Write a protein that binds this ligand. Sequence first.
Ligand code: 799
Lengths: 169, 921
Amino acid sequence: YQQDQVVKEDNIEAVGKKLHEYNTQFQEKSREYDRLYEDYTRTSQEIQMKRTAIEAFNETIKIFEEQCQTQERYSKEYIEKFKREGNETEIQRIMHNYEKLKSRISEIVDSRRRLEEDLKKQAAEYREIDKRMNSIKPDLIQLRKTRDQYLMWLTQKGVRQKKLNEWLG
Amino acid sequence: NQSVVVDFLLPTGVYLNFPVSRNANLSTIKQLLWHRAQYEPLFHMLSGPEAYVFTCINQTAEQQELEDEQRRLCDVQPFLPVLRLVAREGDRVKKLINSQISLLIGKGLHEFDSLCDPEVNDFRAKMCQFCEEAAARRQQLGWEAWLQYSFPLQLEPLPNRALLVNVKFEGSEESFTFQVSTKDVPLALMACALRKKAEQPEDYTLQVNGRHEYLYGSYPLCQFQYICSCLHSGLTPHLTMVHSSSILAMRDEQSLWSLEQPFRIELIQGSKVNADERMKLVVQAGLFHGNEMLCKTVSSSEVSVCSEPVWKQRLEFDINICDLPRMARLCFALYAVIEKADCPIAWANLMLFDYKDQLKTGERCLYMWPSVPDEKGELLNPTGTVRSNPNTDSAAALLICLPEVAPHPVYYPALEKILELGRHEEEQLQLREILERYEHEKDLVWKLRHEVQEHFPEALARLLLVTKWNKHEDVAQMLYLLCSWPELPVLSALELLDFSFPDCHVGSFAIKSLRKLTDDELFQYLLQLVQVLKYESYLDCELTKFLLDRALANRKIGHFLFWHLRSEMHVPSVALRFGLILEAYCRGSTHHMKVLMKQGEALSKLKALNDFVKLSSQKTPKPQTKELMHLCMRQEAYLEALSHLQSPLDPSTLLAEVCVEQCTFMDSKMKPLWIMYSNEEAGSVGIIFKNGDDLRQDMLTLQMIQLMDVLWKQEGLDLRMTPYGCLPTGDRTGLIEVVLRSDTIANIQLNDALLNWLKSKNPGEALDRAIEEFTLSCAGYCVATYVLGIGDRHSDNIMIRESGQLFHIDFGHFLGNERVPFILTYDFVHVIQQGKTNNSEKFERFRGYCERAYTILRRHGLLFLHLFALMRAAGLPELSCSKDIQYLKDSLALGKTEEEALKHFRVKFNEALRESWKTKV
Ligand SMILES: Cc1nc(-c2cn3c(n2)-c2ccc(-c4cnn(C(C)(C)C(N)=O)c4)cc2OCC3)n(C(C)C)n1
């Protein structure tokens, strides 16, 4: 008066054939998981690299912003002191030099912009990986649990280790 | 292309943008900068170039003042090619050190600041002062002591024969050769050499020329490795006399228990949850102390799958607040389940008390780690790290809220207040029996817990695991005993560092018993002590303090501490904890920090070199790839980086000059580089840089073979093993020592045959030694491999030295990953017997060696179990559970008596000898 219905087949060969099918299916799903888990870890490493690369873009731009602040403060008296004693050359060279600096910042901002687009795109991937791993787990776990039930069923029935191995490996 | 357009920002606001060479050093770039600046505005207001320093943003996103201008631009590796001029200003030493630390540990120090964490900040504060204190203290100390720090003695763990030795002085062509016994103290040897023609020998030390290895102290000549090594082979030792002042040159470096409320929490929301829409999400929570639970594990309702699921549930646990222990650990797992009208998604752990002993309150956002399906499919993951996921922007997370227990905050009681409550035969037979080798038995042990302290001091672990940690009354009583528990041997303490014993009082006792450790012994367990840090709850702990203590006292220890920690800085779960230790060490070791940088750069160029060779092999044939590999090495930046550095595998070894013609790679799976060195001061070392594959498994194995070799040597049994160097240095990156004058058995047979090969390498008299070297080593590796369960053995992964010594490599599979039988190979037995059909006199000696070897390992069997038990922290696939530890128990047959063990080993041995003939046919 004790019950637990689990195994579908009911003979030592038919069960062992099903054990060979379930084991193969387990190992193939494990390879699917492990293969994605490399993508997850690699993508995680890559995403962090992109994140510090953005902090690098910030800290560079920040240096250019400091340069502009200085340019403006520093240049005031020189442009005015060269206006009197009419050196209009030196004023225009300074401002063009400054316009060249401002122009360079906009390239670095564009370069930062592109890397932010990559990290956005790769964040979408990271989640897509993690979503796919979580749809594989229940199958992978069911296949582990089934496999083990068939092994146990055959071990109870008294099947020798030699016969168990040739079904597994 | 060879040139780069570099941006130059002048301190007058002016900006320049011209091309320079990647190989050009910063000093040259400044000259070229000043030449261009002449013809740009505001040049009259600049000072001379010497007044200024280049600044850049380096690869770690941090500003770096580039003080050394002999350094090349390509070596600096600024993020974008941008140099700013700034004042040579302020405390440049602190700023320069912080930059170099960031680059060295492969984590920018700012990332620690960014976290805005008191715990991090307090740690960095406390430890950096502690390490800086040791450093300053160290500096004051004399050359004798400093030598012992910098280059600590390497001794072997006993006849009195006589052989000559070559001794010279520094900066002199003339060298003196003369006779000396094996049992002389080095002071006497110096005194003898000091007689140059007709100074004092106490102001000297003997250096092994070609390598940073010194001979000194109250010890005989033959106990030194160099002398021992050379005397075995017969070679003349080459020492060098160095002056005491010459060492000083190197030295130049500068209320709760009232709260009877049940414990509860508010589960608010999930975030960034990726799952199947058809399924529904559930969160299971459980409190833990170590491995064992504190109460039953509650659960949530079935809310439907989305990215941002909302629960808002009062999860109430079957335990009070006053009941919760010091190291209480709330543990979440998020699951996706069918409605029923299971998939573990992720998990997160959380210490209920914070680092300052305060019971936490308010909202916590726990950034969850993903669940990986293992064999033991547990509900929760209490062994997992307490540290949060650093992928905060993209990773899933759980938002919770611990409620306000009282108006004023609450702390866990102090030692004084714990000791207050702590003060309050047929049993003697029953107890003994239990500890001489369980719900009924636990209560017996608990009742008789005072008798355990007096009469069974070594059974402390058992007593801790029987203690009811959920009951706070019991916890007081157990700690009371612990704080006056007698000091246990190292062996017991090693068990106590395991995750089963999370309490800070246990760990502190563990470390307290580990302070009697010598540096030689400590080094034997250093790998394991590093892994145990992954079980630690808080950053500031005893184990970190201890490791840092010893690392500052011994540079060799410091060296391998650094690399163990450095090589896992890629791993998110330890990168923070390890980062802060690497920082602290670096602050207390500014000198050694320069050596470790030079190594890191070697390893960085090698990776880049290996990547090229990997790609070229697919495109082109080997000869052309080897030629193109040399071309890359010929480059000024490469050659200088790879040349002249202390070896990561052994810092006493000098890798002086790369032999580029002798360098190549190996066709193997991940095409490892073969790099060859030589030094004219010595002395021809070789390394294998392997990248793409994990070397942690090999290192552990070799560590254990080394330990066996020591355990055997301590009983006067030198089995001539070869525990070659193997060190993981990064993400799937390591160095392997090349053992000179050796080849694989397959190759020697490819050119009966093994025996003839030994004739050519050992003619006449030598051959007798070569066989003995073979037998002694063949025994040790036969036992070693059997014990450790190292399968997959064959001719490609067993090598032999020209000396005669056999040894194994590539220990990828181990602990039977089913039992590996004991293995005698006919080809080896054939050599052992000196080519004969029957030579039982010789074969009996070999049987005796194997038995004595195996016997000795059982005598130290628990040492091996305990160490392996701690390596479960490392997350190796083939060492992850009790079954993997059980392999060692059965292979050393600890459950069986010593007589029973030997009889079984013989039976195995005999069947191996029987199987040896069958395999051959
Ligand atoms: C996991 C792993 N471990 C190793 C590994 C570990 N070792 C060696 N390889 C190793 C390999 C060759 C040599 C050697 C010395 N001389 N010669 C030659 C040129 C034949 C000679 N006699 O003229 C070869 C010495 C060695 O040292 C022992 C440790 N490998 C590799 C498969 C990548 N992979």
